[PDB]
Amino acid sequence: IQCSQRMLSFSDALLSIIATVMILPVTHTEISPEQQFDRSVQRLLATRIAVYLMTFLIVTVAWAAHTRLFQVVGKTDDTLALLNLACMMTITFLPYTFSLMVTFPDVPLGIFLFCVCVIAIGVVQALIVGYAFHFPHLLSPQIQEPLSKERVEAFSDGVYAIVATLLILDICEDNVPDPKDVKERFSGSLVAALSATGPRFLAYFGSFATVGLLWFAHHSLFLHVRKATRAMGLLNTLSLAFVGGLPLAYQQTSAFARQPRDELERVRVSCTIIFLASIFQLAMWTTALLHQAETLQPSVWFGGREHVLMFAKLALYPCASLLAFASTCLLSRFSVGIFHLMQIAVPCAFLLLRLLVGLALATLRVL
Amino acid sequence: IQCSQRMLSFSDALLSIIATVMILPVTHTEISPEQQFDRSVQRLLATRIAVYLMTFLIVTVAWAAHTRLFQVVGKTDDTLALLNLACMMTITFLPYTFSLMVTFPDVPLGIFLFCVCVIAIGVVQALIVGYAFHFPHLLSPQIQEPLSKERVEAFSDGVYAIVATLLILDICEDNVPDPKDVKERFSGSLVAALSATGPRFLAYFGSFATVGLLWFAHHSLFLHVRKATRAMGLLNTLSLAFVGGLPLAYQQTSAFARQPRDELERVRVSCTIIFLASIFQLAMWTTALLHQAETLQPSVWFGGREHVLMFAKLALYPCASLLAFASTCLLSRFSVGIFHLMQIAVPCAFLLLRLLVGLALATLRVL
Ligand SMILES: [Cs+]
Ligand SMILES: [Cs+]
Ligand SMILES: [Cs+]
Ligand SMILES: [Cs+]
Ligand SMILES: [Cs+]
């Protein structure tokens, strides 16, 4: 009998990466001025977004099934480890089946391959369960539907890390200039290319700050969570699904970004993505507050010491993105400036959150 | 005061992904028949491999510095969490500095940016240390150079997962056919395209099996390790660095693979990569055996119950790849067949390792 922590952690990392890499087809979508007014390319972009969401949810379902299985397994062995590796191999091939299905929906080949993959996952999991029940010592103590917190945490961490890596790869792809381009612009001057590419560098830091602050909010939330209910897990899955779309909002090399579009439209899309990513974390927090005794620690109970702090932590980004979208809709003049100011201000608010909470609550109490 | 497990796990995941994504430039290298005999493209491929190795080692050094720092920190706070996120942001920008340096080595801009990034990492880490020492409660109990095992495990898991994801992405990119291609080959027949693309599907399973079995060996090794010495950490870093090259060996869409080359040369390259990946794990095992009392559990001591099993587990792949290379060099006729037979046999040997060890040792004892 061996400990099963590392095996499940590796499974979580693999599955998170597999679920998050479904956004790449969306990022690489190409639209040009010649095809700007064509309907097919717009419909294709929309369908690709939908496909990304569906594939993310499928991979998440598979991961949850694996977690429920290894909650009963408990202790792993060499045989069970190899069988879990086979199950991971089977799950990883789902992306290819869905790619085939997307390329050829009417043809039944992709459907058959997807069904065969699901059936292989099923038989492998059934073999693992039968092996564990055959040998009592392997099973968990309780045997011999809240999901486990550690698994959810690992999956979320993997998703966020992959998003950040996508951002930095986009920077590495776009910002670097070519020798011929440098020579044509100026007489072999790279300082000038740096001067021309600085805003891109700063936008990268802004995007990474956004992702890191969202992760910080999620981490602070799950630190205070005694138990994670199934509803909280579903809301977390939705939040992660909409977190995977951040590259679509904060990428320059992406063919998606390189299309005829107005600045206000890009700002609106990015704000909507951020709001959708953060509102589901806020919903997790509220749902946990409903059943505070079981799903939360005493500190974050209603009227607790850190309740207001956590509420502000999780409501900072949603309210800010909603304000940015409202400014885009109403003012129509300073929207981009408001969005950039918010991008650079939300970090500062996070760093000084406790002092702001204190001063605000004190001022409201006095008056 | 808050627990620092999840923060460090997220840092490990991010840094592992960042270190492993340095292989992508190598995979996307293009060589054509027109430029087959040109020296520049071959030299470029070699230099890109070297650059990948160097960048991996740099990111690993940064990760090790962070681990040594947070061994003293112990307990994290909101401020320390945000500062660690800033440090991760700074480390993630190293890829871009190195890309600029590669594109323009003679120009000093990339060098200056790299130095500034290192200096920013330094100042952020110094601020974290001063903050922790300013507040005694945050520091670890021991304060108020063996690396931590959990961090190494997480980093290795991330690297392996990213390799597997690269493999599956390569499959998704190449194997899927286009509608026009299907129509030109046959009268709208996708079953025929499947029949033509089957060997690629099977090669994917072979490559994933290779990666998963290497991970299984590493996991079995670290399960029995009481303490991880600095030398073992360095050997693990080298093993991971040479594991990142597996995509170069098991990818079809990669422009690297799409070049004029003989089958025997590809087999030799893949075998060399696998041998280099596994021999360093074997070296970790031997180095730990030297100081068995401190670096190993009683089971794997010399003459232990699981010593022979672990030795076989960690020597299966090195010996097999060496045999495949020797067959390539000597026989020159059935080398590819031997390589494929080995690819599909090593998994079976892993699954039946205990029975083979038993029968072999018994036969040797009797005779
Ligand atoms: Cs974890
Ligand atoms: Cs992870
Ligand atoms: Cs971990
Ligand atoms: Cs990881
Ligand atoms: Cs990628």
PDB file of all heavy atoms in Angstrom, chain A residues 2 6 17 92 96 104 157 165 168 177 194 201 204 218 223, chain B residues 2 6 17 92 96 104 109 157 165 168 177 201 204 218 223:
ATOM      1  N   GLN A   2       0.537   2.199  -0.865  1.00  0.00           N
ATOM      2  CA  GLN A   2       1.281   3.441  -0.999  1.00  0.00           C
ATOM      3  C   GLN A   2       0.323   4.621  -0.917  1.00  0.00           C
ATOM      4  O   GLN A   2      -0.871   4.500  -1.201  1.00  0.00           O
ATOM      5  CB  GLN A   2       2.057   3.494  -2.323  1.00  0.00           C
ATOM      6  CG  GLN A   2       2.991   2.318  -2.547  1.00  0.00           C
ATOM      7  CD  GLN A   2       3.633   2.341  -3.921  1.00  0.00           C
ATOM      8  OE1 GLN A   2       3.379   3.241  -4.722  1.00  0.00           O
ATOM      9  NE2 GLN A   2       4.471   1.350  -4.202  1.00  0.00           N
ATOM     10  N   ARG A   6       0.356  12.021  -4.458  1.00  0.00           N
ATOM     11  CA  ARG A   6       1.089  12.515  -5.619  1.00  0.00           C
ATOM     12  C   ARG A   6       0.448  12.054  -6.922  1.00  0.00           C
ATOM     13  O   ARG A   6       0.415  12.806  -7.904  1.00  0.00           O
ATOM     14  CB  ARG A   6       2.542  12.056  -5.550  1.00  0.00           C
ATOM     15  CG  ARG A   6       3.500  12.983  -6.270  1.00  0.00           C
ATOM     16  CD  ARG A   6       4.799  12.290  -6.622  1.00  0.00           C
ATOM     17  NE  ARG A   6       5.341  12.776  -7.885  1.00  0.00           N
ATOM     18  CZ  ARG A   6       6.614  12.662  -8.248  1.00  0.00           C
ATOM     19  NH1 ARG A   6       7.489  12.074  -7.444  1.00  0.00           N
ATOM     20  NH2 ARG A   6       7.010  13.138  -9.419  1.00  0.00           N
ATOM     21  N   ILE A  17      -4.530  21.078 -17.344  1.00  0.00           N
ATOM     22  CA  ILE A  17      -3.884  21.549 -18.565  1.00  0.00           C
ATOM     23  C   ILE A  17      -4.707  21.154 -19.785  1.00  0.00           C
ATOM     24  O   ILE A  17      -4.891  21.949 -20.716  1.00  0.00           O
ATOM     25  CB  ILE A  17      -2.444  21.011 -18.648  1.00  0.00           C
ATOM     26  CG1 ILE A  17      -1.614  21.527 -17.472  1.00  0.00           C
ATOM     27  CG2 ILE A  17      -1.792  21.430 -19.949  1.00  0.00           C
ATOM     28  CD1 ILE A  17      -0.401  20.688 -17.171  1.00  0.00           C
ATOM     29  N   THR A  92      -7.026  11.982 -21.959  1.00  0.00           N
ATOM     30  CA  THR A  92      -6.285  12.942 -22.768  1.00  0.00           C
ATOM     31  C   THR A  92      -6.627  12.843 -24.247  1.00  0.00           C
ATOM     32  O   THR A  92      -6.451  13.825 -24.975  1.00  0.00           O
ATOM     33  CB  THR A  92      -4.781  12.740 -22.579  1.00  0.00           C
ATOM     34  OG1 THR A  92      -4.453  11.357 -22.757  1.00  0.00           O
ATOM     35  CG2 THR A  92      -4.350  13.186 -21.192  1.00  0.00           C
ATOM     36  N   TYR A  96      -8.828  14.984 -29.042  1.00  0.00           N
ATOM     37  CA  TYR A  96      -8.737  14.617 -30.451  1.00  0.00           C
ATOM     38  C   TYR A  96     -10.092  14.189 -30.999  1.00  0.00           C
ATOM     39  O   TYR A  96     -10.455  14.542 -32.129  1.00  0.00           O
ATOM     40  CB  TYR A  96      -7.714  13.500 -30.649  1.00  0.00           C
ATOM     41  CG  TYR A  96      -7.616  13.064 -32.089  1.00  0.00           C
ATOM     42  CD1 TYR A  96      -6.954  13.846 -33.023  1.00  0.00           C
ATOM     43  CD2 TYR A  96      -8.202  11.884 -32.520  1.00  0.00           C
ATOM     44  CE1 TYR A  96      -6.870  13.461 -34.342  1.00  0.00           C
ATOM     45  CE2 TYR A  96      -8.121  11.489 -33.838  1.00  0.00           C
ATOM     46  CZ  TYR A  96      -7.454  12.282 -34.746  1.00  0.00           C
ATOM     47  OH  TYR A  96      -7.371  11.896 -36.064  1.00  0.00           O
ATOM     48  N   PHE A 104     -15.786  17.402 -38.593  1.00  0.00           N
ATOM     49  CA  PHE A 104     -16.769  16.615 -39.337  1.00  0.00           C
ATOM     50  C   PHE A 104     -17.900  16.220 -38.397  1.00  0.00           C
ATOM     51  O   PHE A 104     -17.919  15.102 -37.863  1.00  0.00           O
ATOM     52  CB  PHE A 104     -16.123  15.381 -39.966  1.00  0.00           C
ATOM     53  CG  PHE A 104     -14.848  15.674 -40.700  1.00  0.00           C
ATOM     54  CD1 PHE A 104     -13.625  15.318 -40.159  1.00  0.00           C
ATOM     55  CD2 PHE A 104     -14.872  16.306 -41.931  1.00  0.00           C
ATOM     56  CE1 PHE A 104     -12.450  15.585 -40.832  1.00  0.00           C
ATOM     57  CE2 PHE A 104     -13.700  16.577 -42.609  1.00  0.00           C
ATOM     58  CZ  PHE A 104     -12.487  16.216 -42.058  1.00  0.00           C
ATOM     59  N   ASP A 157      -5.400  25.796  -9.533  1.00  0.00           N
ATOM     60  CA  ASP A 157      -4.032  26.278  -9.676  1.00  0.00           C
ATOM     61  C   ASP A 157      -3.488  25.968 -11.063  1.00  0.00           C
ATOM     62  O   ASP A 157      -2.860  26.824 -11.699  1.00  0.00           O
ATOM     63  CB  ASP A 157      -3.145  25.653  -8.601  1.00  0.00           C
ATOM     64  CG  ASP A 157      -3.590  26.008  -7.198  1.00  0.00           C
ATOM     65  OD1 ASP A 157      -4.575  26.762  -7.059  1.00  0.00           O
ATOM     66  OD2 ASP A 157      -2.957  25.531  -6.234  1.00  0.00           O
ATOM     67  N   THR A 165       0.830  31.238 -18.451  1.00  0.00           N
ATOM     68  CA  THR A 165       1.810  30.791 -19.433  1.00  0.00           C
ATOM     69  C   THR A 165       1.383  31.170 -20.845  1.00  0.00           C
ATOM     70  O   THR A 165       2.218  31.544 -21.676  1.00  0.00           O
ATOM     71  CB  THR A 165       2.016  29.282 -19.331  1.00  0.00           C
ATOM     72  OG1 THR A 165       2.133  28.902 -17.954  1.00  0.00           O
ATOM     73  CG2 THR A 165       3.275  28.876 -20.075  1.00  0.00           C
ATOM     74  N   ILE A 168       2.298  34.830 -21.341  1.00  0.00           N
ATOM     75  CA  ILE A 168       3.718  35.105 -21.554  1.00  0.00           C
ATOM     76  C   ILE A 168       4.169  34.578 -22.912  1.00  0.00           C
ATOM     77  O   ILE A 168       5.037  35.170 -23.563  1.00  0.00           O
ATOM     78  CB  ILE A 168       4.572  34.526 -20.411  1.00  0.00           C
ATOM     79  CG1 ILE A 168       6.017  35.024 -20.508  1.00  0.00           C
ATOM     80  CG2 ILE A 168       4.575  33.020 -20.451  1.00  0.00           C
ATOM     81  CD1 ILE A 168       6.168  36.523 -20.669  1.00  0.00           C
ATOM     82  N   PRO A 177      11.045  41.757 -32.133  1.00  0.00           N
ATOM     83  CA  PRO A 177      11.107  42.171 -33.538  1.00  0.00           C
ATOM     84  C   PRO A 177      12.090  41.339 -34.347  1.00  0.00           C
ATOM     85  O   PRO A 177      12.987  40.684 -33.811  1.00  0.00           O
ATOM     86  CB  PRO A 177      11.578  43.628 -33.436  1.00  0.00           C
ATOM     87  CG  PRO A 177      12.458  43.638 -32.228  1.00  0.00           C
ATOM     88  CD  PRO A 177      11.954  42.558 -31.291  1.00  0.00           C
ATOM     89  N   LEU A 194      12.324  48.717 -28.700  1.00  0.00           N
ATOM     90  CA  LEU A 194      11.876  48.661 -27.313  1.00  0.00           C
ATOM     91  C   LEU A 194      10.906  49.796 -27.012  1.00  0.00           C
ATOM     92  O   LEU A 194       9.844  49.578 -26.417  1.00  0.00           O
ATOM     93  CB  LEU A 194      13.084  48.712 -26.371  1.00  0.00           C
ATOM     94  CG  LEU A 194      13.080  49.712 -25.207  1.00  0.00           C
ATOM     95  CD1 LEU A 194      12.047  49.333 -24.157  1.00  0.00           C
ATOM     96  CD2 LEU A 194      14.460  49.806 -24.576  1.00  0.00           C
ATOM     97  N   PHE A 201       4.743  45.442 -23.181  1.00  0.00           N
ATOM     98  CA  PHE A 201       5.326  44.956 -21.938  1.00  0.00           C
ATOM     99  C   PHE A 201       4.436  45.302 -20.751  1.00  0.00           C
ATOM    100  O   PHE A 201       4.123  44.435 -19.928  1.00  0.00           O
ATOM    101  CB  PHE A 201       6.726  45.545 -21.734  1.00  0.00           C
ATOM    102  CG  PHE A 201       7.648  45.366 -22.910  1.00  0.00           C
ATOM    103  CD1 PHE A 201       8.694  46.250 -23.124  1.00  0.00           C
ATOM    104  CD2 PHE A 201       7.479  44.316 -23.794  1.00  0.00           C
ATOM    105  CE1 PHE A 201       9.547  46.093 -24.199  1.00  0.00           C
ATOM    106  CE2 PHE A 201       8.329  44.156 -24.870  1.00  0.00           C
ATOM    107  CZ  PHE A 201       9.364  45.044 -25.072  1.00  0.00           C
ATOM    108  N   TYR A 204       1.292  43.337 -20.518  1.00  0.00           N
ATOM    109  CA  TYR A 204       1.538  41.995 -20.001  1.00  0.00           C
ATOM    110  C   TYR A 204       1.498  41.976 -18.479  1.00  0.00           C
ATOM    111  O   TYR A 204       0.883  41.087 -17.876  1.00  0.00           O
ATOM    112  CB  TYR A 204       2.884  41.466 -20.481  1.00  0.00           C
ATOM    113  CG  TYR A 204       3.360  40.299 -19.649  1.00  0.00           C
ATOM    114  CD1 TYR A 204       2.750  39.057 -19.754  1.00  0.00           C
ATOM    115  CD2 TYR A 204       4.397  40.443 -18.739  1.00  0.00           C
ATOM    116  CE1 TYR A 204       3.168  37.989 -18.988  1.00  0.00           C
ATOM    117  CE2 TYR A 204       4.824  39.379 -17.968  1.00  0.00           C
ATOM    118  CZ  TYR A 204       4.205  38.156 -18.097  1.00  0.00           C
ATOM    119  OH  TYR A 204       4.623  37.091 -17.334  1.00  0.00           O
ATOM    120  N   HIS A 218      -9.423  33.544  -4.976  1.00  0.00           N
ATOM    121  CA  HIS A 218      -9.859  32.155  -4.852  1.00  0.00           C
ATOM    122  C   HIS A 218      -9.128  31.445  -3.717  1.00  0.00           C
ATOM    123  O   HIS A 218      -9.729  30.665  -2.965  1.00  0.00           O
ATOM    124  CB  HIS A 218      -9.640  31.424  -6.175  1.00  0.00           C
ATOM    125  CG  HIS A 218     -10.138  30.013  -6.178  1.00  0.00           C
ATOM    126  ND1 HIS A 218      -9.473  28.989  -5.542  1.00  0.00           N
ATOM    127  CD2 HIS A 218     -11.236  29.455  -6.741  1.00  0.00           C
ATOM    128  CE1 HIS A 218     -10.138  27.860  -5.712  1.00  0.00           C
ATOM    129  NE2 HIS A 218     -11.212  28.116  -6.435  1.00  0.00           N
ATOM    130  N   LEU A 223      -9.101  29.014   1.634  1.00  0.00           N
ATOM    131  CA  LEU A 223      -8.403  28.868   2.907  1.00  0.00           C
ATOM    132  C   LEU A 223      -9.384  28.853   4.071  1.00  0.00           C
ATOM    133  O   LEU A 223      -9.151  28.183   5.083  1.00  0.00           O
ATOM    134  CB  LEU A 223      -7.389  29.997   3.089  1.00  0.00           C
ATOM    135  CG  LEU A 223      -5.940  29.713   2.694  1.00  0.00           C
ATOM    136  CD1 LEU A 223      -5.131  30.991   2.783  1.00  0.00           C
ATOM    137  CD2 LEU A 223      -5.329  28.634   3.572  1.00  0.00           C
TER     138      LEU A 223
ATOM    139  N   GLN B   2      -1.300  32.354   7.674  1.00  0.00           N
ATOM    140  CA  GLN B   2      -1.995  31.389   6.838  1.00  0.00           C
ATOM    141  C   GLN B   2      -1.017  30.320   6.373  1.00  0.00           C
ATOM    142  O   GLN B   2       0.195  30.540   6.307  1.00  0.00           O
ATOM    143  CB  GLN B   2      -2.644  32.062   5.621  1.00  0.00           C
ATOM    144  CG  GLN B   2      -3.585  33.203   5.966  1.00  0.00           C
ATOM    145  CD  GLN B   2      -4.097  33.925   4.733  1.00  0.00           C
ATOM    146  OE1 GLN B   2      -3.747  33.576   3.606  1.00  0.00           O
ATOM    147  NE2 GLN B   2      -4.931  34.937   4.942  1.00  0.00           N
ATOM    148  N   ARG B   6      -0.528  25.903  -0.522  1.00  0.00           N
ATOM    149  CA  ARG B   6      -1.138  26.115  -1.831  1.00  0.00           C
ATOM    150  C   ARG B   6      -0.391  27.176  -2.630  1.00  0.00           C
ATOM    151  O   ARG B   6      -0.249  27.054  -3.852  1.00  0.00           O
ATOM    152  CB  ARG B   6      -2.603  26.505  -1.665  1.00  0.00           C
ATOM    153  CG  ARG B   6      -3.465  26.123  -2.850  1.00  0.00           C
ATOM    154  CD  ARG B   6      -4.745  26.931  -2.901  1.00  0.00           C
ATOM    155  NE  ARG B   6      -5.156  27.198  -4.275  1.00  0.00           N
ATOM    156  CZ  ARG B   6      -6.392  27.519  -4.638  1.00  0.00           C
ATOM    157  NH1 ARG B   6      -7.352  27.618  -3.729  1.00  0.00           N
ATOM    158  NH2 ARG B   6      -6.666  27.743  -5.915  1.00  0.00           N
ATOM    159  N   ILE B  17       5.762  24.879 -15.732  1.00  0.00           N
ATOM    160  CA  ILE B  17       5.243  25.139 -17.073  1.00  0.00           C
ATOM    161  C   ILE B  17       6.164  26.097 -17.818  1.00  0.00           C
ATOM    162  O   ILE B  17       6.454  25.908 -19.007  1.00  0.00           O
ATOM    163  CB  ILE B  17       3.803  25.678 -16.991  1.00  0.00           C
ATOM    164  CG1 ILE B  17       2.881  24.640 -16.347  1.00  0.00           C
ATOM    165  CG2 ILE B  17       3.284  26.025 -18.371  1.00  0.00           C
ATOM    166  CD1 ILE B  17       1.624  25.226 -15.761  1.00  0.00           C
ATOM    167  N   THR B  92       8.428  34.973 -14.606  1.00  0.00           N
ATOM    168  CA  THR B  92       7.789  34.604 -15.862  1.00  0.00           C
ATOM    169  C   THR B  92       8.265  35.459 -17.028  1.00  0.00           C
ATOM    170  O   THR B  92       8.182  35.013 -18.177  1.00  0.00           O
ATOM    171  CB  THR B  92       6.270  34.714 -15.735  1.00  0.00           C
ATOM    172  OG1 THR B  92       5.923  35.991 -15.186  1.00  0.00           O
ATOM    173  CG2 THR B  92       5.726  33.615 -14.838  1.00  0.00           C
ATOM    174  N   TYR B  96      10.953  36.111 -22.005  1.00  0.00           N
ATOM    175  CA  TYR B  96      10.981  37.170 -23.010  1.00  0.00           C
ATOM    176  C   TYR B  96      12.369  37.786 -23.123  1.00  0.00           C
ATOM    177  O   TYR B  96      12.843  38.073 -24.230  1.00  0.00           O
ATOM    178  CB  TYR B  96       9.952  38.247 -22.682  1.00  0.00           C
ATOM    179  CG  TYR B  96       9.974  39.380 -23.677  1.00  0.00           C
ATOM    180  CD1 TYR B  96       9.423  39.227 -24.940  1.00  0.00           C
ATOM    181  CD2 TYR B  96      10.566  40.594 -23.365  1.00  0.00           C
ATOM    182  CE1 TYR B  96       9.450  40.252 -25.859  1.00  0.00           C
ATOM    183  CE2 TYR B  96      10.596  41.628 -24.278  1.00  0.00           C
ATOM    184  CZ  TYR B  96      10.037  41.450 -25.525  1.00  0.00           C
ATOM    185  OH  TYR B  96      10.064  42.475 -26.441  1.00  0.00           O
ATOM    186  N   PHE B 104      18.820  38.914 -30.706  1.00  0.00           N
ATOM    187  CA  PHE B 104      19.846  39.950 -30.829  1.00  0.00           C
ATOM    188  C   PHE B 104      20.874  39.760 -29.722  1.00  0.00           C
ATOM    189  O   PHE B 104      20.815  40.427 -28.681  1.00  0.00           O
ATOM    190  CB  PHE B 104      19.228  41.346 -30.769  1.00  0.00           C
ATOM    191  CG  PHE B 104      18.035  41.517 -31.662  1.00  0.00           C
ATOM    192  CD1 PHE B 104      16.758  41.567 -31.129  1.00  0.00           C
ATOM    193  CD2 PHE B 104      18.188  41.628 -33.032  1.00  0.00           C
ATOM    194  CE1 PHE B 104      15.657  41.723 -31.947  1.00  0.00           C
ATOM    195  CE2 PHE B 104      17.091  41.786 -33.856  1.00  0.00           C
ATOM    196  CZ  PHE B 104      15.823  41.834 -33.312  1.00  0.00           C
ATOM    197  N   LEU B 109      20.517  45.183 -25.388  1.00  0.00           N
ATOM    198  CA  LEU B 109      19.196  45.396 -24.803  1.00  0.00           C
ATOM    199  C   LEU B 109      18.722  44.172 -24.028  1.00  0.00           C
ATOM    200  O   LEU B 109      18.288  44.287 -22.876  1.00  0.00           O
ATOM    201  CB  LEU B 109      18.196  45.749 -25.902  1.00  0.00           C
ATOM    202  CG  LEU B 109      16.799  46.144 -25.423  1.00  0.00           C
ATOM    203  CD1 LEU B 109      16.461  47.556 -25.861  1.00  0.00           C
ATOM    204  CD2 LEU B 109      15.761  45.159 -25.936  1.00  0.00           C
ATOM    205  N   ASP B 157       6.035  16.731 -11.542  1.00  0.00           N
ATOM    206  CA  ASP B 157       4.700  16.432 -12.044  1.00  0.00           C
ATOM    207  C   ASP B 157       4.277  17.441 -13.101  1.00  0.00           C
ATOM    208  O   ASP B 157       3.733  17.066 -14.148  1.00  0.00           O
ATOM    209  CB  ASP B 157       3.701  16.420 -10.888  1.00  0.00           C
ATOM    210  CG  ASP B 157       4.025  15.366  -9.849  1.00  0.00           C
ATOM    211  OD1 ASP B 157       5.013  14.627 -10.038  1.00  0.00           O
ATOM    212  OD2 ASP B 157       3.293  15.279  -8.841  1.00  0.00           O
ATOM    213  N   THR B 165       0.799  16.973 -22.519  1.00  0.00           N
ATOM    214  CA  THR B 165      -0.099  17.896 -23.203  1.00  0.00           C
ATOM    215  C   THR B 165       0.467  18.309 -24.556  1.00  0.00           C
ATOM    216  O   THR B 165      -0.278  18.450 -25.532  1.00  0.00           O
ATOM    217  CB  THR B 165      -0.354  19.129 -22.340  1.00  0.00           C
ATOM    218  OG1 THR B 165      -0.606  18.728 -20.988  1.00  0.00           O
ATOM    219  CG2 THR B 165      -1.549  19.899 -22.870  1.00  0.00           C
ATOM    220  N   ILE B 168      -0.303  15.484 -26.990  1.00  0.00           N
ATOM    221  CA  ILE B 168      -1.688  15.401 -27.445  1.00  0.00           C
ATOM    222  C   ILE B 168      -2.027  16.576 -28.356  1.00  0.00           C
ATOM    223  O   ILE B 168      -2.815  16.439 -29.298  1.00  0.00           O
ATOM    224  CB  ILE B 168      -2.658  15.312 -26.253  1.00  0.00           C
ATOM    225  CG1 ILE B 168      -4.074  14.978 -26.730  1.00  0.00           C
ATOM    226  CG2 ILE B 168      -2.699  16.611 -25.493  1.00  0.00           C
ATOM    227  CD1 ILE B 168      -4.171  13.794 -27.671  1.00  0.00           C
ATOM    228  N   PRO B 177      -7.833  15.520 -40.562  1.00  0.00           N
ATOM    229  CA  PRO B 177      -7.754  15.911 -41.974  1.00  0.00           C
ATOM    230  C   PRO B 177      -8.680  17.069 -42.309  1.00  0.00           C
ATOM    231  O   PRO B 177      -9.639  17.367 -41.592  1.00  0.00           O
ATOM    232  CB  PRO B 177      -8.193  14.633 -42.699  1.00  0.00           C
ATOM    233  CG  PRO B 177      -9.180  14.010 -41.766  1.00  0.00           C
ATOM    234  CD  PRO B 177      -8.793  14.420 -40.358  1.00  0.00           C
ATOM    235  N   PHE B 201      -2.284   7.506 -34.364  1.00  0.00           N
ATOM    236  CA  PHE B 201      -2.991   7.278 -33.111  1.00  0.00           C
ATOM    237  C   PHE B 201      -2.205   6.336 -32.209  1.00  0.00           C
ATOM    238  O   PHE B 201      -1.992   6.629 -31.028  1.00  0.00           O
ATOM    239  CB  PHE B 201      -4.388   6.707 -33.380  1.00  0.00           C
ATOM    240  CG  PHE B 201      -5.203   7.503 -34.362  1.00  0.00           C
ATOM    241  CD1 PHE B 201      -6.200   6.892 -35.105  1.00  0.00           C
ATOM    242  CD2 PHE B 201      -4.981   8.857 -34.540  1.00  0.00           C
ATOM    243  CE1 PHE B 201      -6.955   7.615 -36.010  1.00  0.00           C
ATOM    244  CE2 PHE B 201      -5.731   9.582 -35.443  1.00  0.00           C
ATOM    245  CZ  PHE B 201      -6.720   8.962 -36.178  1.00  0.00           C
ATOM    246  N   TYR B 204       0.851   7.800 -30.686  1.00  0.00           N
ATOM    247  CA  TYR B 204       0.522   8.674 -29.566  1.00  0.00           C
ATOM    248  C   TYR B 204       0.422   7.886 -28.266  1.00  0.00           C
ATOM    249  O   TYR B 204       0.956   8.307 -27.232  1.00  0.00           O
ATOM    250  CB  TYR B 204      -0.788   9.411 -29.816  1.00  0.00           C
ATOM    251  CG  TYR B 204      -1.369   9.975 -28.541  1.00  0.00           C
ATOM    252  CD1 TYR B 204      -0.785  11.070 -27.919  1.00  0.00           C
ATOM    253  CD2 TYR B 204      -2.482   9.400 -27.944  1.00  0.00           C
ATOM    254  CE1 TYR B 204      -1.300  11.584 -26.748  1.00  0.00           C
ATOM    255  CE2 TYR B 204      -3.005   9.908 -26.772  1.00  0.00           C
ATOM    256  CZ  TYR B 204      -2.409  10.999 -26.178  1.00  0.00           C
ATOM    257  OH  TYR B 204      -2.924  11.511 -25.011  1.00  0.00           O
ATOM    258  N   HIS B 218       9.828   7.642 -11.408  1.00  0.00           N
ATOM    259  CA  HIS B 218      10.213   8.746 -10.532  1.00  0.00           C
ATOM    260  C   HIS B 218       9.362   8.769  -9.265  1.00  0.00           C
ATOM    261  O   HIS B 218       9.871   9.020  -8.164  1.00  0.00           O
ATOM    262  CB  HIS B 218      10.097  10.070 -11.283  1.00  0.00           C
ATOM    263  CG  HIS B 218      10.556  11.257 -10.496  1.00  0.00           C
ATOM    264  ND1 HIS B 218       9.807  11.809  -9.479  1.00  0.00           N
ATOM    265  CD2 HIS B 218      11.685  12.000 -10.576  1.00  0.00           C
ATOM    266  CE1 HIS B 218      10.455  12.840  -8.967  1.00  0.00           C
ATOM    267  NE2 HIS B 218      11.598  12.976  -9.614  1.00  0.00           N
ATOM    268  N   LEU B 223       8.779   8.013  -3.466  1.00  0.00           N
ATOM    269  CA  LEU B 223       7.963   7.484  -2.378  1.00  0.00           C
ATOM    270  C   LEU B 223       8.833   6.858  -1.297  1.00  0.00           C
ATOM    271  O   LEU B 223       8.489   6.898  -0.109  1.00  0.00           O
ATOM    272  CB  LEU B 223       6.967   6.456  -2.913  1.00  0.00           C
ATOM    273  CG  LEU B 223       5.553   6.942  -3.231  1.00  0.00           C
ATOM    274  CD1 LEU B 223       4.773   5.832  -3.903  1.00  0.00           C
ATOM    275  CD2 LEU B 223       4.836   7.411  -1.976  1.00  0.00           C
TER     276      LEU B 223
END
